[PDB]
Design an enzyme around this catalytic site. Sequence first.
Site, short mmCIF file in Angstrom:
data_model
loop_
_atom_site.label_atom_id
_atom_site.label_comp_id
_atom_site.label_asym_id
_atom_site.label_seq_id
_atom_site.Cartn_x
_atom_site.Cartn_y
_atom_site.Cartn_z
N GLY B 62 -4.50 -0.91 2.01
CA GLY B 62 -3.69 0.30 2.23
C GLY B 62 -4.06 1.41 1.26
N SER B 91 -9.91 -5.17 1.68
CA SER B 91 -9.88 -3.82 1.16
C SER B 91 -9.20 -3.87 -0.19
CB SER B 91 -9.26 -2.88 2.18
OG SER B 91 -9.62 -1.56 1.90
N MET B 92 -8.09 -3.15 -0.33
CA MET B 92 -7.29 -3.11 -1.58
C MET B 92 -6.74 -4.50 -1.95
SD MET B 92 -7.49 -0.77 -3.55
CE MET B 92 -6.23 -0.87 -4.82
N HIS B 116 -14.85 -3.34 1.49
CA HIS B 116 -15.59 -2.15 1.99
C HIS B 116 -15.20 -0.91 1.19
CE1 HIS B 116 -12.60 -0.14 4.82
NE2 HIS B 116 -11.95 -1.24 4.44
N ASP B 165 -18.22 -3.04 6.15
CA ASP B 165 -17.30 -4.21 6.06
C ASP B 165 -18.13 -5.47 5.78
OD1 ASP B 165 -15.62 -2.16 6.86
OD2 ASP B 165 -14.65 -3.31 8.47
C1 LIG Z 1 -8.60 -0.73 2.00
O1 LIG Z 1 -7.45 -1.03 1.78
C2 LIG Z 1 -8.93 0.69 2.30
C3 LIG Z 1 -8.34 1.13 3.64
C4 LIG Z 1 -6.94 0.61 3.86
C5 LIG Z 1 -9.19 0.64 4.79
C6 LIG Z 1 -8.30 1.44 1.19
O2 LIG Z 1 -9.05 1.10 0.08
C7 LIG Z 1 -8.46 2.91 1.42
O3 LIG Z 1 -9.55 3.39 1.48
N1 LIG Z 1 -7.38 3.63 1.56
C8 LIG Z 1 -7.52 5.03 1.83
C9 LIG Z 1 -7.12 5.81 0.62
O4 LIG Z 1 -6.26 5.39 -0.10
N2 LIG Z 1 -7.72 6.97 0.43
C10 LIG Z 1 -7.36 7.86 -0.67
C11 LIG Z 1 -6.89 9.14 -0.05
O5 LIG Z 1 -7.54 9.55 0.92
O6 LIG Z 1 -5.95 9.72 -0.60
C12 LIG Z 1 -8.51 8.26 -1.59
C13 LIG Z 1 -8.16 7.95 -3.03
C14 LIG Z 1 -9.76 7.52 -1.24
C15 LIG Z 1 -10.81 8.56 -1.04
C16 LIG Z 1 -6.58 5.41 2.96
C17 LIG Z 1 -5.20 5.54 2.41
C18 LIG Z 1 -6.52 4.30 3.96
#
Ligand SMILES: *C(=O)[C@@H](C(C)C)[C@@H](O)C(=O)N[C@H](C(=O)N[C@H](C(=O)O)[C@@H](C)CC)C(C)C
Lengths: 191, 186, 184, 182, 181, 183, 191, 183, 184
Positions: B62, B91-92, B116, B165
């Site tokens: 997330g 992911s997270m 990823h 991925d």
């Molecule tokens: C894994 O959990 C990734 C997604 C859920 C697939 C997660 O790591 C992720 O990329 N989340 C992304 C995010 O938090 N992006 C923030 C944002 O755009 O504010 C930046 C810090 C990353 C460039 C979104 C929330 C899915």
Amino acid sequence: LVPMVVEQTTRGERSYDIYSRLLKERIIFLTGQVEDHMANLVAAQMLFLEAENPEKDIFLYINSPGGVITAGMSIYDTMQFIKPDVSTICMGQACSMGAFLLTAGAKGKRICLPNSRVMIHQPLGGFQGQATDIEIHAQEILKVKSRMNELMAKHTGRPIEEIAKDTERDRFLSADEAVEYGLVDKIFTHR
Amino acid sequence: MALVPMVVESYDIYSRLLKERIIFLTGQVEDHMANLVAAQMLFLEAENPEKDIFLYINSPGGVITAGMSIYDTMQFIKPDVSTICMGQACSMGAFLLTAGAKGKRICLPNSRVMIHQPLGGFQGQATDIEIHAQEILKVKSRMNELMAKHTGRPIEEIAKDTERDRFLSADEAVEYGLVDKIFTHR
Amino acid sequence: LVPMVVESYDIYSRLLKERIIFLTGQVEDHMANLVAAQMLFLEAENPEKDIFLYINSPGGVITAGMSIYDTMQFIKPDVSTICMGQACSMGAFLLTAGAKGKRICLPNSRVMIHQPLGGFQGQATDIEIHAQEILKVKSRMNELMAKHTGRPIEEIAKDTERDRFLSADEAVEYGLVDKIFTHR
Amino acid sequence: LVPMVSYDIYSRLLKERIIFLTGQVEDHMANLVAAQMLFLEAENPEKDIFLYINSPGGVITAGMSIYDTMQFIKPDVSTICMGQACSMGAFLLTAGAKGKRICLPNSRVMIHQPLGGFQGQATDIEIHAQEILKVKSRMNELMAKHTGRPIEEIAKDTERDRFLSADEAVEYGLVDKIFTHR
Amino acid sequence: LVPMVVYDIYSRLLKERIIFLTGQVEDHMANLVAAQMLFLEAENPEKDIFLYINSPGGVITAGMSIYDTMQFIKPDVSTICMGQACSMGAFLLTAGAKGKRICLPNSRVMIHQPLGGFQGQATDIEIHAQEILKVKSRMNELMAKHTGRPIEEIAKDTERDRFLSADEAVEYGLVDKIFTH
Amino acid sequence: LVPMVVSYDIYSRLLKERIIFLTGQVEDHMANLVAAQMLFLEAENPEKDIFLYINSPGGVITAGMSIYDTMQFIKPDVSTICMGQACSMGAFLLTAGAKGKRICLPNSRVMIHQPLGGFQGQATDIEIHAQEILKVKSRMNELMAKHTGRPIEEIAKDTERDRFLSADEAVEYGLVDKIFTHR
Amino acid sequence: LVPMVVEQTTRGERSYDIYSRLLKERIIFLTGQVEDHMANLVAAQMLFLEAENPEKDIFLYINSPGGVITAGMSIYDTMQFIKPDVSTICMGQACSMGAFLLTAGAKGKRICLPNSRVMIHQPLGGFQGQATDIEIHAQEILKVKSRMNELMAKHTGRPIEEIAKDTERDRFLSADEAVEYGLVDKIFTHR
Amino acid sequence: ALVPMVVYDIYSRLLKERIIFLTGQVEDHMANLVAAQMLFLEAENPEKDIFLYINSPGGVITAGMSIYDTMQFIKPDVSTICMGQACSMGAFLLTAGAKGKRICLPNSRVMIHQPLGGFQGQATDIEIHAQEILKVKSRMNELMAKHTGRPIEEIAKDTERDRFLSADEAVEYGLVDKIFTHR
Amino acid sequence: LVPMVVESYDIYSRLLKERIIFLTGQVEDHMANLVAAQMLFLEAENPEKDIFLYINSPGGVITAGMSIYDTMQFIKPDVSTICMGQACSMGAFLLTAGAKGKRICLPNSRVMIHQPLGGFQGQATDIEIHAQEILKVKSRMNELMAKHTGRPIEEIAKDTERDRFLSADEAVEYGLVDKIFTHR
Ligand SMILES: *C(=O)[C@@H](C(C)C)[C@@H](O)C(=O)N[C@H](C(=O)N[C@H](C(=O)O)[C@@H](C)CC)C(C)C
Ligand SMILES: *C(=O)[C@@H](C(C)C)[C@@H](O)C(=O)N[C@H](C(=O)N[C@H](C(=O)O)[C@@H](C)CC)C(C)C
Ligand SMILES: *C(=O)[C@@H](C(C)C)[C@@H](O)C(=O)N[C@H](C(=O)N[C@H](C(=O)O)[C@@H](C)CC)C(C)C
Ligand SMILES: *C(=O)[C@@H](C(C)C)[C@@H](O)C(=O)N[C@H](C(=O)N[C@H](C(=O)O)[C@@H](C)CC)C(C)C
Ligand SMILES: *C(=O)[C@@H](C(C)C)[C@@H](O)C(=O)N[C@H](C(=O)N[C@H](C(=O)O)[C@@H](C)CC)C(C)C
Ligand SMILES: *C(=O)[C@@H](C(C)C)[C@@H](O)C(=O)N[C@H](C(=O)N[C@H](C(=O)O)[C@@H](C)CC)C(C)C
Ligand SMILES: *C(=O)[C@@H](C(C)C)[C@@H](O)C(=O)N[C@H](C(=O)N[C@H](C(=O)O)[C@@H](C)CC)C(C)C
Ligand SMILES: *C(=O)[C@@H](C(C)C)[C@@H](O)C(=O)N[C@H](C(=O)N[C@H](C(=O)O)[C@@H](C)CC)C(C)C
Ligand SMILES: *C(=O)[C@@H](C(C)C)[C@@H](O)C(=O)N[C@H](C(=O)N[C@H](C(=O)O)[C@@H](C)CC)C(C)C
């Protein structure tokens, strides 16, 4: 789910939610969008903890992307008014109004965690109606922008002109950069 | 609402296991559920700052900043946070699993791990797009560095592998250095 | 609402004292986490007394169900599985995963088995990665079904290519469950 | 807003060994009934249980979780029809302990064959159609067993919606008696 | 509305042997392009056809209906990129007769691998995945033929979005020349 | 979630310190809750001051007048403290506080403007509702004039359109008495 | 609705819509949001008017708040390619890509009507997905922004640095200011 | 379709009589159609008058100004007749007609008021858009002053809020020249 | 669709040559503009032959109706009004606005009169302006009704405070129309 803890008494048992239990340790949480209701709750917690002991520190954990400015200034003015020092700790992120409340802490007790993100930028707004009313609301937003820069300048120790330049567009800071800018004082890694 | 509860004389199964120093990270990582995990951790430290905390992870991931609020809480508190992967850590979720205390990062045999690169999305003036594009590179670099540190693999290899991925079995997660050991039977 | 009993317990907390857990409806992360939590609680309570998992599920998310499966195998107590109403898809997999000799169908309960479902959208490179992953999961699920039933993986694969419905008697003959309970 | 007495009204009547089956039959509410039955068995496995039924029916498998629980537990499950018992609700009414299946005078009973719905490949439709017929055959057999009417007559009568009064439900053998006053 | 002349403007420019491919590539708008190409062949099978491309792409099979019609008909099809030619639009631009594939100065070209998406039983997912890989390979082969670049290089370059200027499109081999005045 | 203390919730615990919160849009139910707290605190001790913390953009006038008339009626002095902002009806209830006990915090905002309304239907009914809105507008301007000490003609001119005041401007105008920075 | 005009012939009558009738006077209309289809129709009209007479002027009346850049650049490249001079006249407003196509007219034949409004600003955009893809799309928007500033500089005769500074935020010009800035050449009040 | 012959509606037939209709909300596409009809009637005959019937509550200012500038540019005098109502931008285009040839029908309604607008975004952008609306407001007041012969200060005062005029009042104000009752 | 006739005309264009105009349904700017356009056309064709306006309307927007009314009064030809089905609110106003001696109800036609409707929301100052305007329009509408009916303005005002339904016979007695047409 809100997790409960059971304390045994002479007359059986009583119960605390986890947040009520950490409030006894003088720990308040500011989490998510800043709006009137959640901001009032934070202010209420500060007033309660003052009444309980007006000489012990309050720890305000901030994880917020910001929100309503007036709602935030309700918290800000409460922090300055109450006798206790309000130590601000950044969790995850403190952006916009969250960054403002993070920098508004007692000098020497404004903390970032290592991988916490800080972001600052000028106010947002939006009116619709008669041209006369648009001028009035346009004048108000400028006054608020000047005031918010004035307070940021005071709490950071940077001149107002530099705060103005840097918040014209989104300015992202790491924990290290937030210390160098003067938004926070120190970084906590391990206790 | 609160599931399988008894009144105090509502106390639920999660409240009961919290006495056993067990926290659950379940579903999409966002500010509110993350604040709840961090709060449970801060509580368990105050109760006993020397006993281990067990963090059961079943998450597809997330919001990164929300996950980082847990990560920094895990590193800050004096207790070792043992991480156990139930069902999936992606992911997270994979990040927080590998962020456990060294020697105490566990997968169950049929748990799935997936890593990823970050996702993002801005809209507006080209100047603002450039600012947010730069910020997303900064976060991507940082996440790779922390993944490199916790796995013991070089940042160049983490970056290559997380461009797309990358699904790992419990065996593959140990080999990669995401977890330490596999628990099948007590 | 859920009824309470004074001794004050909700009906599920009261049956949990008899070491009974219920798996009901679609298998997803939150309800599956609860099942796993109850299993860990009962082990800590007494690691040598049997746990009774009543299953009425059409199935759902595989990873969520594998969180229950891995917990069942890990905890010291034998987990006896009882099928109420139906055990289909992932529910059928968790029914057959119970301790050998303690997998029970009720007389008019229904069991159904079939291969996994999935779906991705995006670049052809990503589609190939997700297609490979779904094949590995399918192979693994078929291996574990073969292990618990005692049937060869080739037969489990053939039989689960399309929906396969079994009566209580047919589930015993397939090896998904051991015995049928009618009266005490 | 459920009233109190220490107890909520339903929990208080659960001490009197009274369970309520109210509204559409689905997995969660059906599990709750089966749980109350297992609880009452553990409390006293010889005293009767009273299952008040006011249901238009619903999910068959959800209903069969209750039916199999009723047959398994040692206590006799007396069924009382309040307002109506149709489809699956009628089936659970007739599944009560013989001598102790009760309709109230103005309660309505109704029976009809299963409903279903699949879409997809012709091969899968054939599998799902065959499964629905096996369930229909099984449901008719159990209805025949509890009513004492032969399966051929249960089949004919449930092809379309068949409504019965309390008197007609006793004549059909779905219930044993009618309670008007205590 | 579409203005008229004493013929709508599109029918009038069809006399000059001009066809427009505008917006998302789908079955119906692609069928119209292929129809116009068959018509112009029947009118005169020796004279060149001018196809003006302004497309972000769309459905591959709909685009392969135009491609196959372009190759089949006797006349040379001259492709002119105005505004942009991305994805399938880029593929049809490069599919024009060698020496007659044109970019206007401020036209943009973009190439990337196919998109797909199935949901259902694991067996069906495997059948549709194999199909998407076969199409990807075929599209890369045809891109290699029309550009003159080896299939391996086309594969690398289309793994992610690759934007080219008019000048870069000439250097890559997607188009042959740039028309200004 | 509102946290508990030893058992009271935080708002019930601050009510023992004779503190009431007016937060968000003014409507019947939240306004009733404020007036209930005011009647409760009066019964508990009818001589000790009450502290009303206002953070409101305004709302329904009748709902706000339920608080105003309760404030004046109860024996205890009601001290009004402006948190964040007090606009429209929020500003009215701020200036309604006991004289010498109407407080702004330094960065609190105050805004005043004339009533809003809206009716649809027969021209006869439109006339009745238009008259009623003018009578209310007059009454509100009179009460604003009484509490600020500025003549009604000036209040009318100044509220014809949105008028934004800082803490300092609110003291000068006579909407509040003083500014509180530190305790 | 669209009003028709009837021309009498030897064999009774024929009918033109008002826009088809004015196209015989070599007048094209660019009205509303710029997108592929309406832009293609403008280009088609230009290619038609070239084939009819490649030496007579084309009058392009512009009343647009702007729209898709590639759609507008399909019109721009057509204008530069065709032999005929394209005289641009601003009706009501020419904002964004509207202002870009107004300034792209033949030198000496770019016209504002007295009370017409002109506005210029940098490109907008927005992607979502993998960080790698965000980077690529972010590099593309910058390349387009540079190219659009270069062409604005060429057509206005102002240096690229000044065009860049002035288009960072929305810049509104009156007819007089548009002549002074060099977006248009002259102002038409009466014939 | 409309009310036609196949050879063409009642508007096409009245366009031959040099009559254009401006009906409903003023926006780009209907305003483009008005300007197009005006350019056509000039080309057909640049000396005969054009009659523009106006029944409009107003709409987009820039759209309305595309017509205004077309009216002033073309050689033919544009006579404006108010049918039913001419409000906001409709009233503006009514008063913008050739001097001596601006007509109200007896029971037609005229209403003038200042521009409307609305931006949302960064404070800096809000300042830019807030300035633009003030420039437009000034320009519209200047052009109204010119066409009416009243001073811009009186136009400004009168258009701060909605100002409704009868046919008689529109003549007195100088928005139109004369009233047509019977031929 | 609308049927055509060859001499090629649509049915309404064909009846327009017999100087017949139709006012049908809710009165709004666009349909009212069409009626007014037809009235100007017929005047230009022959300014000394009567025009026949057939009215079947529940009413609608007053200003849109006044666009027809002012056109009726302005043009040289007498505008005869015939009520088909119903003429209520603005339709009743336009019916009674016909040339004296040439306002006609059909036997089973319904007429209804009542005061204007309105609706504003905003600042109390703006509400006062719009309220005053509603009252001015109400006064003007009652005046014009009083003129055409020959009843005093006090009576028109009383009778239109609420909905007043009239038969064809009652419409003649009130002075809204002059005569009833049953057969030719
Ligand atoms: C894994 O959990 C990734 C997604 C859920 C697939 C997660 O790591 C992720 O990329 N989340 C992304 C995010 O938090 N992006 C923030 C944002 O755009 O504010 C930046 C810090 C990353 C460039 C979104 C929330 C899915
Ligand atoms: C950061 O938190 C800012 C945005 C939420 C990103 C925040 O500071 C902000 O600008 N909030 C804005 C706001 O409160 N604006 C008020 C308003 O328009 O009423 C003005 C007082 C600002 C001059 C938006 C509206 C939340
Ligand atoms: C039975 O429970 C199956 C369906 C509910 C009918 C269940 O086993 C199943 O296939 N669930 C599916 C699922 O979990 N798919 C995962 C996924 O895409 O995340 C694949 C990894 C399986 C290889 C669907 C998604 C519910
Ligand atoms: C009475 O309660 C019947 C319906 C509610 C009218 C009930 O007996 C019934 O037919 N239920 C159906 C059902 O459960 N069908 C399942 C199914 O679709 O899988 C089959 C096993 C029985 C044919 C409806 C769909 C709930
Ligand atoms: C470029 O135009 C591509 C996208 C629009 C970005 C286009 O080539 C493309 O990938 N189209 C895709 C498509 O047509 N896919 C078909 C399909 O999945 O049915 C496959 C045969 C290609 C693997 C999407 C679906 C439009
Ligand atoms: C400030 O709070 C004002 C509004 C929020 C802008 C408030 O004073 C106000 O005008 N409220 C309005 C209102 O209550 N109007 C009532 C009504 O029409 O019911 C009349 C009594 C006003 C004449 C709006 C409707 C909330
Ligand atoms: C004025 O017309 C601008 C906006 C419409 C206000 C226009 O120039 C603009 O920025 N258009 C944006 C655009 O075309 N973006 C494309 C795109 O990202 O797809 C890029 C090629 C421009 C960098 C539209 C509105 C997105
Ligand atoms: C009368 O017609 C006015 C409104 C419709 C009531 C009209 O004059 C008006 O103000 N229109 C407004 C408008 O065009 N505003 C533009 C804009 O925001 O783009 C500004 C140029 C006005 C200063 C609104 C949009 C209808
Ligand atoms: C009969 O047709 C009447 C209504 C449809 C019942 C009609 O006469 C009427 O009252 N129309 C109304 C109207 O035109 N109101 C305008 C307005 O509010 O703008 C005022 C001029 C009323 C004085 C309604 C709005 C249709």
